[PDB]
Design a protein around this ligand. Structure first.
Ligand SMILES: N[C@H](CCC(=O)O)C(=O)O
Lengths: 150, 151
């Protein structure tokens, strides 16, 4: 499983154009889901997202995590992360989980996100649909995790 | 070398704030240089950045690249990509290249980008400075490349 975590002042997610999602300060989380992810993969992700320490605090660095600062999370599904760029300039996304069944997985993950923090503080995007998101990158801080490194 | 590439309608790169960079359509690339990166490691990035066909063009999808549609690239150095998070919740940047050499390897990379696309098309941040980037994520579309899985 694959996540890009970008630290943000805020985020505003939009479909076709309308704002349906918003966080002010927090993390944006681009979530790619391999065809062979097991629930465990989804735990590791959920965990680190909440748990990683991407904020300095009062003369200390990399110290407080989302939860601590009472900050939100914008979870967007992103298969393009299994974009394969070793064939050629066109990317084949084979290695990503099939949308109809990936959608189940996402939702599970989104529920468990809430149970692992505070439902009031987890936002999402429309799975199927094309999205336009305005991001304020704070720093910025980009962090990559491929759960298949365990 | 690591890189995140997101397709975007535009971007604004401000510093501590007063602005320094805009792009309309195109790509933004957070690029992490690994302590050991050869010049090859660069090229693969640069090559794959310009040439990746990420825009639907006509009734075709995943077809046209950034140089084709005549779009910009904003290149933001981002060590936190070698934030080792595997063990611990405090990220571990030991695989990252020192900011003094990093600066020129980044420079050299920016040259080559220009040198290969166009001087006006390549935009940047202020290396290793707190930056703020308004990014209009179109799609969205995100691509990882670790140049170390390449043979
Ligand atoms: N690669 C993007 C995907 C956006 C979508 O999910 O529709 C596109 O073709 O527009």
């Amino acid at each position: 499983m694959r996540v890009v975590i970008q630290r943000v002042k805020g985020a505003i997610l939009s479909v076709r154009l309308e704002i349906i999602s918003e966080i002010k300060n927090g993390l944006i989380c681009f979530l790619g889901i391999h065809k062979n992810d097991t629930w465990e993969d989804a735990l590791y992700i959920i965990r680190k997202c909440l748990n990683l320490r991407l904020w300095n605090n009062d003369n200390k660095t990399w110290d407080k995590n989302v939860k601590d600062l009472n900050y939100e999370l914008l979870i967007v599904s992103q298969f393009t992360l299994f974009g394969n760029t070793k064939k050629g300039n066109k990317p084949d996304f084979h290695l990503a989980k099939e949308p109809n069944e990936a959608l189940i997985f996402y939702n599970k993950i989104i529920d468990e996100f809430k149970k692992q923090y505070n439902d009031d503080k987890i936002k999402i995007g429309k799975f199927g649909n094309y999205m336009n998101i305005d991001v304020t990158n704070d720093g910025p801080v980009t962090i990559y995790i491929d759960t298949h490194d365990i």
